[PDB]
Design a binder for this molecule. Structure first.
Ligand SMILES: Cc1ccc(OC[C@@H]2CCCN2C)cc1C(=O)N[C@H](C)c1cc(-c2cnn(C)c2)nc2ccccc12
Ligand SMILES: [Cl-]
Ligand SMILES: [Cl-]
Ligand SMILES: [Cl-]
Ligand SMILES: [Cl-]
Ligand SMILES: [Cl-]
Ligand SMILES: [Zn+2]
Ligand SMILES: [Zn+2]
Ligand SMILES: [Zn+2]
Ligand SMILES: [Zn+2]
Ligand SMILES: [Zn+2]
Length: 311
């Protein structure tokens, strides 16, 4: 008979006494140790005092599980623990003062998202996400990467899109303050104004240039081709996306960007960031140049309060 600690958040620890003849799953339900499914294993003696994650099976654990993760999905813990088993074996080197990921298990898109998050202002709503976000900025990003996979319903090895991953993550962040007022002008229908809030205020799909979005873009009207342009923008950042195309990035005009080379889904991501010069982060590899032209699909810009001067 050894004594262990059960938890769902690694904050509120619940003390439990176990028998070494019954498997952990027989006594606690699905039980994990550092991501490893210990349901069908029996209590060994090094397990004394260690803390185990358990699937919630009473109301106290169910409430604590939501407080930390903001989900009642019973599959979340297993998908989280399954991803953590891999991500804690990845390497997280510091590259140009940023935490990256050494290439493994098709994690190129995760590294790009991880690098981008360290350069934009964002507060996550689930304490689980915010706490691991902090530890990731400090170099320990294994837990943060596993959570990203779980929250995106993706598995280790699956092929991932950075824009899609950021969008999922943005929906779990406090972007209530973010506002985007747009104006569409049609030669016949007229002129109409719509205001966006939250995730749609900080993302646009169609062009990489924030300036071009300010000047206006050609979009079809409900009558059949108008023009939409940005009127007001109140967000700490914006994300501009377009299907991969050749694009020139100039030092000091953007924060960071996603480079995508190769076939749809089968390709590989690289990360470009603007510092004193242009830097390219490819997992553990770093290169720098003063100019850059290449296939870009996301560009991130800084923002605070913008109001247009078009009459
Ligand atoms: C790497 C990757 C993983 C997954 C993925 O999809 C997953 C699907 C998609 C829908 C929901 N999910 C389950 C996509 C890509 C991808 O290769 N992503 C790269 C940037 C990519 C994006 C787009 C695109 C996005 N929106 N639109 C209008 C066009 N077109 C591309 C054309 C050629 C080459 C790359 C393109
Ligand atoms: Cl409940
Ligand atoms: Cl209940
Ligand atoms: Cl959620
Ligand atoms: Cl890769
Ligand atoms: Cl979701
Ligand atoms: Zn309840
Ligand atoms: Zn792995
Ligand atoms: Zn969710
Ligand atoms: Zn019209
Ligand atoms: Zn890849």
């Amino acid at each position: 008979t050894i004594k262990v600690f059960t938890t769902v958040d690694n904050i509120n620890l619940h003390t439990q006494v176990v028998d070494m003849s019954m498997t952990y799953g027989q006594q606690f339900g699905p039980t994990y140790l550092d991501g490893a499914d210990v349901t069908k294993i029996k209590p060994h003696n090094s397990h004394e005092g260690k803390t185990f994650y358990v699937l919630p099976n009473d109301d106290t654990l169910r409430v604590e599980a939501f407080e930390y993760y903001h989900t009642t999905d019973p599959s979340f813990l297993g998908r989280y623990m399954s991803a953590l088993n891999h991500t804690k074996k990845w390497k997280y080197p510091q590259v140009n003062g940023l935490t990256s990921i050494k290439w493994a298990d098709n994690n190129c898109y995760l590294a790009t998202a991880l690098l981008t998050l360290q350069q934009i202002e964002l507060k996550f709503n689930p304490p689980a996400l915010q706490d691991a976000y902090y530890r990731a900025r400090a170099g320990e990003a294994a837990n943060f990467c596993a959570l990203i996979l779980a929250y995106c319903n993706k598995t280790v090895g699956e092929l991932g899109d950075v824009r899609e991953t950021m969008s999922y993550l943005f929906q779990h962040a406090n972007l209530d303050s973010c506002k985007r007022v747009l104006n569409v002008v049609c030669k016949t229908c007229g002129q109409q104004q719509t205001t966006l809030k939250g995730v749609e205020a900080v993302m646009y799909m169609g062009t990489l240039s924030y300036e071009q979005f300010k000047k206006g873009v050609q979009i079809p009207c409900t009558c059949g081709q108008a023009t939409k342009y940005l009127v007001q923008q109140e967000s700490p950042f914006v994300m501009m996306s377009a299907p991969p195309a050749q694009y020139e990035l100039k030092h000091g005009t953007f924060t960071c960007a996603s480079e995508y080379t190769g076939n749809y889904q089968c390709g590989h991501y690289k990360h470009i960031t603007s510092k004193e010069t242009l830097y390219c982060i490819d997992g553990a590899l770093l290169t720098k140049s003063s100019e850059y032209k290449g296939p870009i699909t996301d560009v991130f810009y800084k923002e605070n309060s913008y109001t247009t001067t078009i009459k």
